Subunit: 193 residues, 4 copies
Amino acid sequence: TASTGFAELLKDRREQVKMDHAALASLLGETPETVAAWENGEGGELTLTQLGRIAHVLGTSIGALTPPAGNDLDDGVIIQMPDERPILKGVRDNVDYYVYNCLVRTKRAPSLVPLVVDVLTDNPDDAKFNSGHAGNEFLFVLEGEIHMKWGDKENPKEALLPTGASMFVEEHVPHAFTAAKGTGSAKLIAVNF
Amino acid sequence: TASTGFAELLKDRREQVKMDHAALASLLGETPETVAAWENGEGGELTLTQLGRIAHVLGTSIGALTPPAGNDLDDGVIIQMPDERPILKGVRDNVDYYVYNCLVRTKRAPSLVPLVVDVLTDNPDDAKFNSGHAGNEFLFVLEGEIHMKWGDKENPKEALLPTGASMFVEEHVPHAFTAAKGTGSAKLIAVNF
Amino acid sequence: TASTGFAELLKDRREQVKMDHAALASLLGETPETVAAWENGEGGELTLTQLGRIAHVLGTSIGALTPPAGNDLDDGVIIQMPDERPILKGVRDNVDYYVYNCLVRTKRAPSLVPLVVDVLTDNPDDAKFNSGHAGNEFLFVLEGEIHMKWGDKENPKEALLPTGASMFVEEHVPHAFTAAKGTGSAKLIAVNF
Amino acid sequence: TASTGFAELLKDRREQVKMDHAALASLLGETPETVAAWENGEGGELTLTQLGRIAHVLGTSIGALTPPAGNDLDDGVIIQMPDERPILKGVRDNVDYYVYNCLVRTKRAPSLVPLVVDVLTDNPDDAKFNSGHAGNEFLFVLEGEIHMKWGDKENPKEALLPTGASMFVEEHVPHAFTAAKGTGSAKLIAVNF
Ligand SMILES: C[C@H](O)CP(=O)(O)O
Ligand SMILES: C[C@H](O)CP(=O)(O)O
Ligand SMILES: C[C@H](O)CP(=O)(O)O
Ligand SMILES: C[C@H](O)CP(=O)(O)O
Ligand SMILES: [Fe+2]
Ligand SMILES: [Fe+2]
Ligand SMILES: [Fe+2]
Ligand SMILES: [Fe+2]
């Protein structure tokens, strides 16, 4: 219930900064009746920009006025069966680099992005980097032998990791993988949290 | 930029969750082309409810997809002049209870809500109990004697604060004020944070 | 440098709450010279209880006065080779239940505890529970077929998960596993974050 | 309890990281028996440095192993009477610059540091610039006219605040005060949070 959430959250914030329907409606160029309406979940039709302005007026953020992602835990758990896991071909300049067998996700923890990654190429030098991403990542070499390279794309550090190897990659640090030269392909689990 | 922020964030999350315009538009029932537009700034007219399903599909929250409150500081600062304060006369049980002189606030501190409160009632017995509120609040008796009350509405704790008294009230703790009986009126600084 | 950290942090906090060496030394029953000394890293010999009292006086916590766990990232990464991963037999009432092949850890993120867990028993009913633990957990069925059971130890929910299954277990929720009846043994990856 | 807390936390972490007294005592070079004692409350005499290696072995921080600041509230509250404030006369360049009348503080809000500051100097030109400080600070001109300055020490921003002015200074922003030139003295409420 986006509207319901907004309705409860708007009300709170308004009172929080000591404003009555009238005070607020003014700053927004709206009628007190309207504001009062919104506090009823009748705001569902508001646009992103308006919500943007309402936040500004209330000196806070759209996030602060919208509700939590929600809960989807089955008494505290979510299960994803193997066959029903999303696949996503990944091409770096039309070069099939990875394949993403997306694992179980949850609104109770969106920062969590589990992945079984299929390393397609095995050309260490034809390895394409990523600028690094937000949140840390946990890696476990599933199959084959991954040839990891992190740091500066111009001259990065590196280590070929045998199956069984586990690695941590701090947030925002650039990295790239491929199999050991000539080995063909490899597999690893990638956990972004 | 309420959209611009949304644009780079939708992009961020889309990639984070290993998806493409093509795949995302699908779960939403939109044009693969349409998403692309959103990711380019054309999201401005998206309704609240509409934002709700999107953040859901990306198993995240609208907050996570909208930008932070802007930065409204003048080189990390902001002033408010005395004749510039918003005034809100409070009413509990149809009684000229308080008067809220709203002090400086910053988008960089949504939770900071500084107030000068003029306590108009001087009859403790007639005091009205808010239900408590979120966020801790620091108080300072500006003038007069503040007759305070906190805890349970029926059998509450009492405290007589002389001018200069300073107090802290934890978040969620219910409370009420008045000027000590007969003293007429009191004043105090109330900082919610 | 525990002492160095404390030395810098104590200094900050002291000034923060407006106290001079003398003011502080008093409340602690120490000499100003001593306090001044500590601010030099000469506090290394302080005991847990004393640090406990110093914190109290400064109205803060030992944590707030001690330094961050430190950094061990090799330019942003840590690698653990398969053979060098800690093993830990786990017996529930002398019943070899699990085996813990601990993966790469890091001071930059202690909440992260990666584990390859060897499910030894395969008696669903002889399954022993855990009261649930702090932080969420990500699970991936490595080998065999795990027989998961979560919730109330008296009557929990359950699902036998085929290899490839991935599950999320919210913090503090009780859980237990074993292989599918008769299958012998199973393996899964456990990520606590 | 500075130990009691440490005891249950060491226990917590030990288990969290999949270890036993036997294994932990090893990396520390202690008696498997010794750890057990720690886990039972006998940790009181552990030196700071000693705490440093322990938290290290458990790849975590001393903070994570020590308990939170206690709770010092009277049913979620605490008062401070005017003749009860700690007084600290400030000195910058050997000048009776400020005077700090320390208001109420709570262990439940380590960062809340409320102050009544008596500004003794009235020569802007003689003002001394702190280097900025952590945590945002809300100010209120109690009496007089506060001649303010913020930004760079050489070419700073100036602002003349009349009694009643309210201002916010972001964390890390350098600044200085005095009473407007010739006015003799000013007073203001400074709330660090
Ligand atoms: C394995 C890699 O970490 C996956 P990427 O972040 O490059 O998408
Ligand atoms: C003074 C009071 O603390 C302000 P209220 O909480 O009633 O809004
Ligand atoms: C697999 C389980 O999650 C490991 P436990 O938390 O019971 O130690
Ligand atoms: C008033 C000032 O803001 C207090 P200082 O930062 O100098 O400690
Ligand atoms: Fe990655
Ligand atoms: Fe209040
Ligand atoms: Fe677990
Ligand atoms: Fe300051």
